[PDB]
Design a protein around this nucleic acid. Structure first.
Ligand code: MG
Ligand code: MG
Ligand code: MG
Ligand code: MG
Length: 438
DNA sequence: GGGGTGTGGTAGC
DNA sequence: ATCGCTACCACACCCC
């Protein structure tokens, strides 16, 4: 047990946090792409007609944690048992659940306690531990396989378990559903072999948004090919409103209020107007959804194809610790802030940059919220506060940055015992060149 | 037209 | 027990 005032807290928390792993893995994949392409020009031009293959592991952590499970779980059956990956037994996040579990309504992000109640009696939840190194090794085999196939002009990392793969079609060549199905089946088989038993699903289309939707329709362990020319009511009626990229719970609530609770993308596209859309969820998001309901990408989403090097380039650097934060005095808070700045500057030096603007954000216990929340060591119900500061000169100096971060904490006025979370941010990064004379 | 700030939401497991 | 990260767009609202 490592408490937050222990010097090892940051190391231990990040070693156990799957959300930290997800972000660190994604950051590393983007840096790797930039390094491998520093002298290449595989970007998509206006002259290119392309097919998108959106490829994603099915129930990634659950599949891999199963395939690598310890001898204690040897009898576990991936096809018949409801399986989750999680740390705990009660108010612990289900990071991933297999499709047996999902047949009872269990979802990624659910607490174990909530998921257990959806099982009929006699049906036992199997909880597997995280296998983080294995997750990374399987993802390595995934990206290795995608490259080795020599069928994509551009391979964009989305996450540890997901990539957007672009195939350029010469007008020389007549593309067909038959060829696309064969490519999907090749990819699915080669990844199944290369990962020793993991399955991917694939969405294949001529836009990013349709490929994402096709991917959802393909799961589990399948593929779907839906081009703009194949769109139909049957397609749109198959999707929930929050199946649309960019539509989470808050946008969903607004759409349901404005449009009389649509229950499918078909309902929505028959009811909406562009203007009512923009009024409900905002102008840019409204335009994105409007175009999406046409099967079309918006300008912002297309930038990753036209200029992947710019989109994938890191523009900020931060840490967030909103779990296990229980400090008794300002001395201990300040030491934790110093430890966090040390960690961030190590990352900042690895990428050979300085920073010209920093932010501290905190979570503070709501005045009427219990001191110990339902989730062990959780932040609970909180109010958020943030404050930023522009540095005079771009710098990587601990003394300057840590001192200003601690000043920023002081100006937010949160008593140490009320603190439930801290984020430390370098908002603007500046290159370091060969000329540092003045 | 340019700039700034803090806040909100989403994305992957 | 339990590990509720983190990058980045978009917004509302302020200044010249
Ligand atoms: Mg998915
Ligand atoms: Mg997946
Ligand atoms: Mg994924
Ligand atoms: Mg969505």
């Amino acid at each position: 047990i490592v408490a937050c005032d222990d010097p090892d807290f940051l190391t231990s928390y990040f070693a156990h946090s799957r959300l930290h792993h997800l972000s660190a893995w994604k950051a590393n994949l983007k840096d790797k792409f930039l390094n491998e392409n520093i002298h290449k020009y595989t970007k998509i031009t206006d002259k290119d007609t392309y097919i998108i293959f959106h490829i994603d592991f099915d129930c990634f952590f659950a599949t891999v944690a199963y395939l690598c499970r310890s001898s204690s779980f040897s009898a576990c059956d991936f096809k018949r048992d409801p399986i989750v990956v999680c740390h705990g037994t009660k108010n612990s996040d289900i990071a991933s659940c297999n499709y047996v579990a999902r047949s009872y309504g269990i979802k990624n992000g659910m607490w174990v306690s909530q998921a257990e109640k959806m099982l009929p009696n006699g049906i036992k939840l199997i909880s597997l531990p995280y296998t983080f190194e294995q997750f990374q090794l399987k993802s390595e085999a995934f990206y290795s396989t995608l490259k080795r196939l020599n069928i994509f002009n551009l391979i964009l990392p989305i996450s540890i378990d997901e990539a957007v793969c672009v195939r350029i079609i010469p007008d020389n060549i007549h593309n067909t559903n038959t060829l696309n199905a064969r490519l999907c089946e090749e990819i699915r088989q080669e990844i199944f072999q290369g990962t020793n038993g993991c399955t991917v699903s694939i969405g294949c289309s001529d836009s990013l948004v349709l490929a994402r939707l096709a991917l959802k329709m393909a799961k589990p362990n399948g593929y779907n090919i839906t081009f703009k020319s194949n769109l139909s009511e049957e397609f749109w009626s198959s999707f929930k409103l929050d199946d649309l990229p960019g539509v989470g719970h808050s946008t969903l609530s607004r759409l349901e209020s404005t449009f009389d609770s649509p229950h499918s993308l078909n309902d929505l596209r028959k009811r909406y107007t562009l203007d009512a859309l923009k009024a409900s969820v905002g102008s840019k998001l409204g335009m994105k959804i409007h175009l999406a309901l046409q099967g079309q990408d918006d300008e912002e989403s297309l930038k990753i194809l036209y200029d992947p090097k710019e989109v994938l380039q890191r523009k900020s650097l931060s840490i967030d610790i909103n779990w296990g934060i229980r400090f008794k005095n300002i001395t201990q808070v300040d030491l934790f802030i110093e430890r966090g700045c040390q960690y961030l500057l190590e990352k900042l030096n690895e990428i050979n940059k300085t920073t010209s603007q920093i932010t501290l954000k905190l979570m503070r216990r709501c005045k009427d919220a219990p001191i110990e929340p339902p989730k062990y060591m959780g932040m609970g119900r909180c109010d958020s506060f943030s404050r930023s500061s522009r540095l005079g000169i771009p710098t990587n100096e601990f003394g300057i940055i840590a001192t200003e971060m601690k000043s920023l904490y002081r100006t937010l006025g949160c008593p140490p015992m009320e603190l439930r979370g801290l984020a430390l941010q370098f908002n603007k990064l500046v290159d370091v060149g060969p000329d540092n004379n003045q």
